Structure formats: C-alpha cells, structure tokens
C-alpha cells in the first residue's frame with residue numbers, strides 16, 4: 084500500500100529534492116502520498132506545492148502569513164486541507180496516524196523540535212540535519228530508546244551511503260543511533276569520503292589569506308564554508324559515531340575529489356563495501372523513504388567507463404585543523420560535540436562576513452572547547468535537552484566573547 | 491556449534507587459501523572443523539595437510555596413489571581417518587551427516603560431479619569452479635530445484651563481490667541459480683570487473699605475436715596456467731559473464747565488463763534505483779572463501795586493512811572486443827543458450843591448451859572456438875536430470891573432439 088510522507092521544510096534543498104524524486108518515481112508507479120507539507124515562511128511556494136501535490140495537511144511556521152495561506156488555498160478547486168500554523172501545527176502533523184515517514188529538511192531549533200516530535204510519535208524520520216545529531220546526539224539516543232518503534236534513517240549523503248552498504252537483515256536487529264549498531268552489523272571501520280572543498284591545493288601561506296568569497300564563488304553558504312574548512316567532514320565524523328556507534332579511531336576521512344564513491348564500510352573480515360553514484364541527493368532521500376526496499380527510478384545510470392578515474396588522498400590536519408578539533412571533541416565526548424557545533428556556527432558566520440581569517444575559525448573553536456568543562460549527563464530526557472540548549476547557547480556566547488576580546 | 495567443512499582440491503590455490511584462513515579463524519575458538527580433504531593426485535601434500543588438520547576423512551581421486559596415501563598416514567599417531575579414493579570416496583564425503591559446507595576448488599569432471607553430489611545431499615556448496623556453472627548451468631538449476639536445502643554460494647572473486655553487494659535480507663528469500671533472483675534482489679545491472687590481463691595494452695599487430703610464455707611470465711599475480719591463459723585472452727571474463735547470468739539470473743544485456751587494472755574494486759551491482767554498491771579489497775581469495783563459509787555472517791580476520799589513500803588511484807575502461815574476441819563469443823554463446831555455453835567451455839579447454847603448448851597463435855584461439863560454436867546444432871534439453879548430465883557430457887566430449895579436429899585439419 085502507499086508510502087505516506089510528510090515533508091518538513093518543503094521549499095528548502097532537501098524538501099524540493101524530496102518532492103522531485105517522489106514526483107518522478109510516482110510517474111513510474113504510484114507509491115508515494117505526500118500527506119503533509121510544512122514551511123517556515125515561503126507562503127507562496129507552499130501554495131504552489133499544494134496545487135501540485137494536494138496534501139491533507141498544510142502548515143506554515145510564521146503566524147504572520149497564516150491567514151494569507153488559507154486565502155490562497157481557496158483558489159484550489161476541490162480541496163479542503165487541514166491548514167495549520169507554528170509549533171502547534173508541527174505537533175499535529177507528527178501525531179497524525181495517516182503519516183508513516185517524515186522528512187526533516189529544516190535546521191536549528193525547528194529541526195531538533197520537529198525531529199523530537201516525530202520520534203515521540205514513533206515515526207520513521209529521514210534526517211539530513213547533521214548539526215542536530217552532533218549537538219543533541221545523546222537526546223536523540225534516549226528518545227529512540229523510549230520510543231522503540233521510531234527510527235532515524237540518515238539522509239546526509241555519506242551516511243546514506245554507509246547505511247546502503249549494510250545487510251538489512253542485520254540492520255533490522257537494531258536501528259541507527261543505538262549502542263551496538265556497529266557490533267550487530269559486523270562493522271570494523273568507516274571510510275568517510277570528502278570532496279575536499281576548494282582549498283586542497285592551497286599552501287598554509289595561501290590559506291592564511293583566503294576569504295569567504297574564495298570559498299563561495301553549489302550549496303548553502305554555511306555548508307559551503309564548512310566544506311572549505313572541512314569542518315563539514317568533522318561534523319560528519321561525529322555524525323558517523325552517533326548514527327552507527329563507530330569508534331573515532333575507526334573513522335577515516337578520505338579526500339575523493341570526483342565524488343563518485345560516497346563512503347565505504349569495512350567489515351570485521353576486512354571486506355569493504357561502498358556506495359557509488361553521481362554526486363546526488365535524490366538517491367539518499369529516496370532510500371530513506373523506501374528502506375528496506377528500493378524502487379525503480381529514471382535516474383541516469385552511472386557510466387563507470389566514462390568516469391574513468393577515481394582518486395583518494397589523506398587530508399592534511401595542518402591545513403584543515405577543524406578536522407582535528409572535531410575528532411578531539413568527539414573523543415572527549417560528553418557535550419564537547421555540542422560545544423564544537425555551536426562555536427563553529429559563530430566562527431563560520433564571522434568568516435562568512437569577513438570579520439575573521441581562515442585560521443581564526445579553528446582558533447576560536449579550540450579556545451571555546453578548552454574553556455568547557457565536562458558535565459554530568461542527565462538520565463532524564465527533559466533535563467538532557469535543557470543541558471544541550473544551555474551548553475549550545477553558552478558556547479555561542481563564548482565564541483562571540485573570544486572574537487570580541489581579540490578584536 | 492562449529493561449521494563442519496570439506497575441501498575438494500585441498501592442495502590447489504582455493505584449497506590452500508581456504509585452509510590458511512580457516513587456521514587463522516580457529517586460533518582461539520573452534521569456528522570450523524575441517525572434516526574432509528580431497529585431492530586429485532598430490533598425495534605428498536595431502537599427507538602433510540592431514541598431519542596438521544587431522545580430518546575424519548581423506549580422499550584421493552587417483553587410485554594409483556591410494557596405497558601410498560594409506561602408507562604415509564600410518565606415520566601419524568592416534569589418528570584413524572577414513573581414507574577413500576575415486577568417485578566413490580567423493581560420494582561418501584558428500585553424503586556424510588558430519589559435513590555442513592563443501593568448498594569446491596577442483597575443475598573439470600571432478601568439480602562438476604562433486605558439486606552435483608554436494609547438492610544431492612542438500613549441502614552448502616562454496617563453488618569456485620566456474621566451468622561447472624558455464625557448462626552445466628541449467629542442470630545445476632534443475633538439481634537445486636529438486637534439492638531444496640542445497641545452496642551454491644559463489645567463491646569466484648567477482649561473483650563473491652556481487653553477492654556481498656546484495657542485501658542479505660533479500661538474498662535469504664531466494665538463492666543463487668534460482669529463477670527470479672535478480673528481481674527479488676532489485677538488481678538492474680552488473681559491472682563485472684576484470685584485471686584485463688597481460689595483453690590489455692597491446693596493439694593488434696603486437697597481439698598477433700603473443701605467446702603463452704608472454705602470458706605466463708613475470709605475472710603480476712601468479713595463478714594456474716589454464717586461468718592465466720584465459721585471463722590473457724579475456725575468455726576468463728567471458729566465462730564469468732555466463733557465470734554471472736546463471737548465479738544471479740541477470741540478463742546478458744545487463745552485464746557490463748569493465749577493465750579495472752588496479753583490481754581493488756572486485757565488481758559492482760546497480761540496483762533498480764540506479765544506486766551502485768561495490769565490494770573492494772586487495773586482490774584476494776581469502777575473503778571470498780571465508781564469506782562463503784560464514785554467510786550470512788561475517789567473522790573477524792587479521793587481514794591487512796585496505797589503505798585506499800595508498801592505492802590512491804582507481805581506473806576503469808571498456809575492453810576492446812576486436813582485441814579480446816573471446817568476450818564476444820561468450821556473450822553470443824550465452825545469449826543463444828541451449829548447450830552453446832557447454833560448447834564454448836569445451837572448445838576453449840582445447841584451444842587454451844593448444845596455445846599454452848605453442849601449437850596455435852592468439853587469434854587462432856577464438857577462431858577455433860567460433861568454428862566449434864558454428865558447427866554445433868542445438869538439442870532438445872533432457873527433462874530427466876540423469877539424461878541431462880549425460881547429454882552435457884556427450885556435447886562436451888564432442889566439442890573437444892571438434893576443436894582438435896579443426897586444429898588437426900588447418901595443421
């Protein structure tokens with residue numbers, strides 16, 4: 084019977100890629116029902132998407148465009164959706180028995196809260212939002228132990244790759260973010276592939292003076308800066324640890340400039356399995372919705388002969404010290420990942436806005452990490468989410484204070 | 491608790507690699523019990539293996555060294571194995587309730603017959619003998635339909651790779667050589683990787699001149715003579731295309747040969763969503779063998795971890811069919827079906843050996859094979875399993891004789 088889907092952040096990158104692959108797949112046979120759309124504040128696009136997909140639920144976060152939305156939707160003949168607003172609408176969608184799978188394609192607070200409510204409702208959650216895993220991994224783990232039928236399915240491309248390499252007869256004995264995931268799946272080590280970003284050929288003296296322009300000039304600005312500093316991969320290392328329970332000494336970052344091998348899993352016998360395709364978000368999103376099955380697509384087949392050459396090299400931790408900081412934070416454990424994520428949000432934005440230099444990014448983050456003290460990890464879910472929010476806010480303030488002191 | 495294993499061809503490449511990985515895996519826990527070792531005629535080597543592993547059963551095919559084996563084994567104290575010979579010995583081993591899984595590391599008739607008996611006794615058959623599959627594919631499918639608990643698990647490195655790339659949640663719902671395997675596993679296409687052999691970069695003028703010594707000498711990877719010649723002509727890959735078809739029920743138009751000269755990626759599967767999964771490692775027989783014996787599980791090894799950064803570069807290209815016409819012949823034979831794969835295999839056996847022995851030139855190999863294929867007239871497929879085996883053997887013998895006759899004439 085159908086796959087019933089809600090998209091949170093439907094006008095974002097994840098959201099439109101999801102709707103694209105759904106639409107295309109549905110042309111081949113009707114497998115997907117788009118039951119709910121949720122957007123922040125693109126009331127117009129949401130209306131356009133509603134025309135096409137006609138979900139039972141519409142929701143917009145911003146109350147200031149709530150009335151407008153309702154007014155635009157009247158124009159659609161033969162259509163009486165449930166139209167909702169804000170956090171309250173979010174919760175209603177997540178509690179709907181008609182929804183099976185929820186795509187989280189929003190970031191930050193909205194991202195963690197929708198994820199939380201989707202888990203509390205025992206749904207399958209297709210999560211792209213790595214910062215929520217890095218920052219609030221312990222909270223997600225606890226929730227997933229309370230809500231036994233909820234599952235997080237990874238959509239971040241490298242993590243999708245890893246997941247796609249597994250035997251689902253073993254996956255089904257566990258789930259992502261569970262202790263012992265790697266043990267049950269016989270995983271030994273992970274090769275986490277990277278584009279390497281724009282600065283792999285730059286000397287230290289060149290990196291000293293690179294600018295945000297040099298990094299941007301195709302994805303969002305924040306992830307683009309993180310790809311430039313390789314803090315994206317550093318966050319993706321922590322994401323791997325949490326999703327798959329792989330030790331940090333068994334995660335290896337490898338620079339694969341062609342971006343065809345998306346990542347690789349070494350099993351305990353030392354056999355390596357990898358997932359490969361053109362650089363792509365459609366397959367990761369689609370697999371999150373079809374797992375543990377696959378369905379036909381009309382995607383272009385990989386032409387391995389035409390690709391011709393694949394290359395792999397080790398990243399320099401001197402040139403990309405954000406990688407080292409991510410490992411350090413993850414190995415220290417506790418809430419150090421929360422602090423890393425929060426301090427990077429500030430340092431990334433400073434650099435983006437030409438306030439600091441490349442090596443200042445890692446300097447600031449390092450100084451924030453050094454000032455944090457491990458805290459007792461709460462057993463209680465509500466207390467734990469509070470600790471994470473408090474630490475997150477502290478680390479942002481601290482990063483800002485270190486910036487302002489030097490400046 | 492322990493997996494009880496028989497090894498057919500224990501002193502060949504597959505056999506020696508099997509006992510090496512088994513030994514390592516057995517260091518602490520009793521993971522495997524080596525219950526039976528069989529060889530064709532290497533009686534001295536089998537004795538030495540018997541000393542170490544002390545299997546319940548020993549068997550030599552060559553009855554002329556049966557007495558020598560019994561006399562060597564009397565040297566081993568507090569050991570009273572069952573010592574057998576010939577096809578009767580093969581049959582007794584395959585029939586033993588004390589055996590769970592059988593590694594077939596022997597070729598030609600002994601490979602086919604041991605495979606057959608192993609299936610007829612509902613065993614797990616870890617099959618490295620690709621020629622059995624090419625020659626007797628439909629017969630094996632029929633036997634596997636009769637003996638419902640038997641399984642063929644592939645050991646040929648590329649086929650092991652394909653198998654590993656599949657999702658075992660689907661694999662467990664079917665089995666190799668079963669109709670609908672590719673549908674159940676959501677397979678779209680196979681990239682069947684090849685080393686490309688020693689002659690991959692030769693011009694046509696250069697290639698006309700090659701000899702067996704050129705194929706055999708300073709080889710990157712040292713293997714048996716027959717397979718080394720087939721790697722050189724890429725008939726090995728042609729056989730492996732047919733092997734892929736039969737193991738995985740993949741259509742010939744959905745099997746693509748790719749020359750990957752680094753031999754790290756061992757083969758790839760494209761699923762119906764166009765996602766591709768590959769299996770990679772150093773060139774290696776230990777993981778394929780081990781996985782055939784542990785599937786659907788994996789166990790710890792102390793093999794060297796792949797260092798992808800050190801490998802640094804992986805390359806892919808399409809082989810030239812003008813330079814490697816054996817590939818074309820294999821596809822043609824497979825697509826024709828019937829007993830054309832049997833004929834391809836038998837004629838190649840002859841042509842390979844003529845070239846090995848310096849009696850014909852490189853392009854004469856494919857010429858002879860093609861002439862035998864064109865000579866063969868399709869036959870009604872026997873419905874009875876025993877009739878079908880007898881038909882296969884008749885056609886195999888005919889094709890070898892026809893190849894020899896062609897050589898004799900143009901000579």
Ligand SMILES: O=C(CC[C@@H](c1ccccc1)P(=O)(O)O)N(O)CCCCCc1ccccc1
Nearest residue numbers: 240277278279280301310315316342362363364
């Ligand atoms: O984390 C990421 C972005 C950062 C990593 C990266 C960058 C570039 C290619 C591959 C990977 P990084 O290794 O530099 O840190 N992904 O998961 C890539 C997803 C999108 C790739 C395809 C696509 C579709 C549309 C626009 C643009 C791209």
Ligand SMILES: O=C(CC[C@@H](c1ccccc1)P(=O)(O)O)N(O)CCCCCc1ccccc1
Nearest residue numbers: 647684685686687711721726727753773774775
């Ligand atoms: O069919 C084959 C041999 C032919 C193919 C080949 C040749 C060379 C490397 C890889 C592949 P082909 O592509 O040229 O036809 N395999 O499956 C060989 C796999 C294990 C080779 C490594 C090894 C381990 C132990 C002893 C000796 C060697």
Ligand SMILES: [Ca+2]
Nearest residue numbers: 554555557558
């Ligand atoms: Ca004798």
Ligand SMILES: [Ca+2]
Nearest residue numbers: 654655656657
């Ligand atoms: Ca698998």
Ligand SMILES: [Ca+2]
Nearest residue numbers: 678741743744
């Ligand atoms: Ca097809």
Ligand SMILES: [Mn+2]
Nearest residue numbers: 239240241319
């Ligand atoms: Mn990513």
Ligand SMILES: [Mn+2]
Nearest residue numbers: 646647648730
């Ligand atoms: Mn092979």
